[PDB]
Write a protein that binds this ligand. Structure first.
Ligand code: HEM
Length: 397
């Protein structure tokens, strides 16, 4: 019988053991999604790049072969799906709209603003003390806070409002109250959107409002939709990397020891931590417009395929000793942010966010240790991007 795709990984810090077999044996294996439908899954680095790189592959959720892992997920085509699940002139229309907002030069500038926000998060968290959940306390704190800097949301006036709404917005509580929260988040944005319309600053909203909304390229509804979309793409995952990356540093003290000895590696370490952890893994799902050949096998057309970044980012044909977190890796051409047209737009921020968030903690909370018992750590079992759900830490007062 075709194997059920989603595999619970035993080791948090690495790809599921099944993958190695998949690379060597089944490069293009057939699996059964939780919806009991079938799809193909690619585990090889070189194949993942050709597969995502190929223009014979589409990200349309409308295709009935789409590999949705959710029951009504595929029924997004009948409805209006987000732009990240489209291809053609549609996909490029929004993605290419917000690229100038995310360039390296733009991100290099927020380096001081991003630092200050992170330090503030540390002060309060440091002042209060007590064992606290890093995932809630820090990882998310930075994530949410950094998006405000990019988005243009006022910090003090808001942030608190905003921090909570996102949390409520996604979760398993108050089925009726979600409407209330999304209304808050959306109401907040609308005001900013409208406000920037008059006398706008250097934010994504400003860039979008005065570059596309004002000349009529996007309807106000449209601008709002994407703004919300990028928040989802950049929140759950970024916080997941900080919390998960942080456990690895705690589990192996040999590693942060290196960072302290050489603080220059930090940017390099952020990249290695991305490939070794490979939090996204199953995120990019695509369908074959016409048959595509990879390795020995070929996937028929109109069939759903999933590119496993975790399988790719651990492939030894690319990474010598891929299971060793070597901060000195000679060749880190990882795909943690995907490959191709749909490659992450926030990679630069995620990196600056990750570097600033991780460094500042090692420096500011050196004493930091894990308050909860190890082996008691809880890894999300219901997520798109693998991550921890609770982490408890303390430090010397
Ligand atoms: C934890 C660090 C991150 C990782 C590992 C990551 C990973 C990815 C991956 C694998 C994709 C492609 C999914 C697909 O095939 O459709 C993607 C897309 C995207 N990411 Fe991220 N991401 C991260 C952080 C962020 C941040 C901080 C932002 C900004 C809020 C962001 C914004 C986006 C957007 C807008 C897309 C859609 C690109 C498109 O298809 O046009 N990401 N990301």
């Amino acid at each position: 019988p075709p194997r059920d795709f989603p595999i619970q990984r035993g080791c948090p810090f690495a790809a599921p053991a099944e993958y190695a077999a998949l690379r060597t044996d089944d490069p293009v294996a057939r699996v059964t999604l939780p919806t009991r439908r079938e799809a193909w899954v690619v585990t090889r680095y070189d194949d993942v790049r050709e597969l995502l790189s190929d223009p014979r592959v589409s990200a349309d959720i409308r295709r009935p072969g789409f590999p949705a892992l959710g029951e009504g997920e595929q029924e997004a085509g009948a409805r209006f799906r987000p732009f990240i699940r489209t291809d053609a002139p549609e996909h490029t229309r929004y993605r290419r709209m917000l690229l100038p907002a995310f360039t390296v030069r733009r991100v290099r500038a927020m380096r001081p603003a991003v630092q200050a926000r992170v330090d503030e998060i540390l002060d309060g968290m440091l002042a209060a003390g007590g064992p606290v959940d890093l995932v809630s306390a820090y990882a998310n704190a930075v994530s949410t806070s950094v998006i405000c800097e990019l988005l243009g949301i006022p910090r003090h006036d808001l942030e608190f409002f905003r921090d909570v709404t996102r949390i409520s917005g996604s979760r398993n509580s108050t089925a009726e109250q979600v409407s209330e929260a999304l209304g808050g988040l959306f109401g907040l944005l609308g005001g900013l959107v409208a406000e920037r319309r008059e006398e706008p600053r250097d934010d994504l909203i400003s860039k979008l409002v005065t570059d596309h909304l004002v000349p009529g390229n996007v309807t106000t509804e449209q601008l709002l939709s994407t703004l919300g979309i990028t928040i989802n793409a950049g929140r759950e995952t970024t916080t997941s990397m900080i919390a998960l990356s942080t456990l690895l540093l705690l589990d192996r003290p040999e590693l942060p020891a290196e960072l302290r000895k050489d603080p220059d590696l930090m940017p390099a370490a952020v990249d290695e931590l991305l490939r070794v952890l490979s939090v996204a893994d199953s995120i990019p799902l695509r369908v074959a417009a016409e048959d595509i050949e990879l390795s020995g096998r070929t996937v028929p057309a109109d069939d759903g395929v999933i590119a496993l970044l975790a399988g790719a980012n651990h492939d030894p044909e690319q990474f010598d000793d891929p299971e060793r977190v070597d901060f000195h890796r000679t060749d880190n051409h990882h795909v943690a942010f995907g490959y191709g047209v749909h490659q992450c737009v926030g990679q630069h921020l995620a990196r600056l966010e990750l570097e600033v968030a991780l460094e500042t903690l090692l420096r500011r909370v050196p004493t930091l240790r894990l308050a909860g018992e190890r082996d008691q750590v809880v890894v999300k079992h219901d997520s798109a991007t693998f991550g921890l759900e609770e982490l408890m830490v303390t430090w010397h007062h």
